[PDB]
Design a protein around this ligand. Sequence first.
Ligand SMILES: Cc1cc2c(nc3c(=O)[nH]c(=O)nc-3n2C[C@H](O)[C@H](O)[C@H](O)COP(=O)(O)OP(=O)(O)OC[C@H]2O[C@@H](n3cnc4c(N)ncnc43)[C@H](O)[C@@H]2O)c(O)c1C
Ligand SMILES: NC(=O)c1ccc[n+]([C@@H]2O[C@H](COP(=O)([O-])OP(=O)(O)OC[C@H]3O[C@@H](n4cnc5c(N)ncnc54)[C@H](OP(=O)(O)O)[C@@H]3O)[C@@H](O)[C@H]2O)c1
Length: 363
Amino acid sequence: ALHVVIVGGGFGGIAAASQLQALNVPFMLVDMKDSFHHNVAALRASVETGFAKKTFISYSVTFKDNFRQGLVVGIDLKNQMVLLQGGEALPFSHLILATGSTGPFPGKFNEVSSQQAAIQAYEDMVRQVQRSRFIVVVGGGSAGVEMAAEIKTEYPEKEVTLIHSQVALADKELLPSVRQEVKEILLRKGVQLLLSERVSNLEELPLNEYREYIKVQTDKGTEVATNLVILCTGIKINSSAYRKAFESRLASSGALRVNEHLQVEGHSNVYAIGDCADVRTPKMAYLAGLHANIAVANIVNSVKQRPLQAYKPGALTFLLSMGRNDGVGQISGFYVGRLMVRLTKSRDLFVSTSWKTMRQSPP
Ligand SMILES: Cc1cc2c(nc3c(=O)[nH]c(=O)nc-3n2C[C@H](O)[C@H](O)[C@H](O)COP(=O)(O)OP(=O)(O)OC[C@H]2O[C@@H](n3cnc4c(N)ncnc43)[C@H](O)[C@@H]2O)c(O)c1C
Ligand SMILES: NC(=O)c1ccc[n+]([C@@H]2O[C@H](COP(=O)([O-])OP(=O)(O)OC[C@H]3O[C@@H](n4cnc5c(N)ncnc54)[C@H](OP(=O)(O)O)[C@@H]3O)[C@@H](O)[C@H]2O)c1
């Protein structure tokens, strides 16, 4: 009877599939790519030659028979089936939805693709950055703040402007001390900040592509002349697998309503983990891992007739790398500075934790 299907192999889904496989529980991991994407490092991968090969990890080397590359197009709840484009139906005793989020390319790569194509996409982007003397980053959230710092750190000679629609940078959940220091670090690197300005001609702009002249405009009348436009304008919940089947149980974002055991509302053998769960914390790979531990444990506790584990958030820990040499953040809601973030995140961007989880060695 027992068989756990995991929709999505991001941070959540490979933590779940690793755990299930190590317990020899019957399971199937489904993802549209052939490789796990360490997207935490995607921004460095768009800046450093030869780095992208280190951010994609073949699923089938790690999971073999229990991994299927396919696009989930629906879930049949009365027959307990996951429906794949091309006609495959996977039955389940327990379902884990780990579909994460979608957004503009450099920061997210969600295509039915091979590892070699994915890698080449990032290598193309490095060549775009390298060619461009003038670069605009759109969006001053936690993503675009890292984009701008990565460019200016790897190429100080380049001119980098960041345009953000708010008065302060990065997440509104962060201690004001972290958000002020993000700004100051950006300024000390030489990044041009254009705050409280929304870019207004986005739908006409060539993206991720060097041009001799691109005119960027804002809603306050500012014009910025540039060679390259990179979008860090934010993400959307990827509800493509499940929106039809779970329509009544969705948040307004598209995320799934859960209880503290991460069971989807109305169900006992369906769980949501990571960005697609309607937990009201910022979207973090770290929390994806923690939701994977709870969901896998609760499937086992659910079948073993043991009480279930609960998720109760602690104070926000959140680190911003500011190039490979700098950064700032907070640990359990307390400020931390360059030395800590530099070695914990900035140097490696957690890449080697994904290789370890996957039992592979980086190329
Ligand atoms: C952009 C960015 C993000 C960072 C960064 N840093 C951190 C960090 O330091 N710590 C952290 O915790 N999170 C960090 N994050 C956040 C992190 O990206 C996310 O919260 C993390 O990706 C969430 O993991 P999830 O598993 O929830 O979601 P993913 O999107 O990673 O994976 C979802 C997968 O489902 C897949 N999928 C497969 N088949 C599908 C189907 N048929 N239908 C729909 N989806 C499908 C997608 O293709 C995708 O691979 C960072 O430096 C940058 C620049
Ligand atoms: N753990 C980490 O260090 C880390 C790193 C990166 C991302 N993340 C997480 O991933 C999630 C996404 O973060 P994100 O930075 O990608 O998105 P985000 O937090 O939504 O930030 C993107 C920002 O871009 C702005 N924006 C959108 N369109 C714009 C335009 N035309 N001109 C100017 N500004 C524009 C948005 O403002 P409006 O809404 O006003 O448009 C928003 O403030 C977050 O939950 C984040 O915490 C975490």
